[PDB]
Design a protein around this ligand. Sequence first.
Ligand SMILES: C[C@@]1(c2ccc(F)cc2F)CCSC(N)=N1
Ligand code: NA
Ligand code: NA
Length: 371
Amino acid sequence: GSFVEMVDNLRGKSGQGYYVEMTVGSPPQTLNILVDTGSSNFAVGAAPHPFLHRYYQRQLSSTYRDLRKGVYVPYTQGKWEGELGTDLVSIPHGPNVTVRANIAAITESDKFFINGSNWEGILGLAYAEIARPDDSLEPFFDSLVKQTHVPNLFSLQLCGASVGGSMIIGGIDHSLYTGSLWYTPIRREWYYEVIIVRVEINGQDLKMDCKEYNYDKSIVDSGTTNLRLPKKVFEAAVKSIKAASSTEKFPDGFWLGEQLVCWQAGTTPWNIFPVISLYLMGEVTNQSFRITILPQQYLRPVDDCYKFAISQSSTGTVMGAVIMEGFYVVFDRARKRIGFAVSACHVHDEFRTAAVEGPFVTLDMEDCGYN
Ligand SMILES: C[C@@]1(c2ccc(F)cc2F)CCSC(N)=N1
Ligand code: NA
Ligand code: NA
């Protein structure tokens, strides 16, 4: 209900992610940690890498314990490798607890840290199934819930534009949203996987087989900036957005995120761009609800210059900061569901605003999931 201590506890820079202040070891070492719902490892820089403001100095900690095991984590972009261990962790602007969590001390990395960023680690908030090296390395939130009375739930209000937000650990803060929370089931506990059952570009359906919206999955990810769509869905959506926005012309490289587009300050054509609606599977048979985003969310500022923050993916749909910045999101792990409500801080205009509406009647929603 009321968690004032944790309100406004997230910071960042546009495109550089959202981070929370954390402490590791005894005596406490303060580090800024990127909040990521799309991964399950608690990894922190442990060496004097030049881009880092600070790093975890194990030698200074009495409570540190070596697991005598390493981990090599490759990505499409980045890569990091580290040494596994456990130590005492706390979240200053979080609950008043201390937990013994697994920590991957990063000893080598490539394209992982950002030059100019104010974070030194990553807090993977997803499930054990996608943990590295394997599902036996218990994620932080699982340790937090197992060792304390903190309820198995956390919520994220990502505000956007120097960026801010809130991570309410163990509860919900009703001051962070307007209207009602609508819940979608977590299909499987690995990533925060959900099912998209319909897509509308300015009230008009894309009329695709809903199985295509979730090929091979759809996930809620605070660590990705964009709304990432499967190629087929992306082609369809772009063709539809391009058509809805043919009042002003743009280079074809722009829709492909290869070129920026620029206009005048105080006069950016918002109304020439359509709203995007995703219909998510509801809690009840044949019942869905829809979430609506504004061009304010998918036209990312980089006079003014913007980026088309909707892109193709071969890993499925990724409901990144583009989606999350319009809503207050509840990761209700206890009830295996994700809640969406209109954010009290989302960026809109006098005309249109983000919306969470329901219920709707959608038949065969289970057939939208990929097997
Ligand atoms: C772990 C990862 C990540 C995020 C931000 C960053 F800056 C570095 C990263 F490696 C992989 C890329 S998508 C994702 N959700 N999380
Ligand atoms: Na409210
Ligand atoms: Na891909």
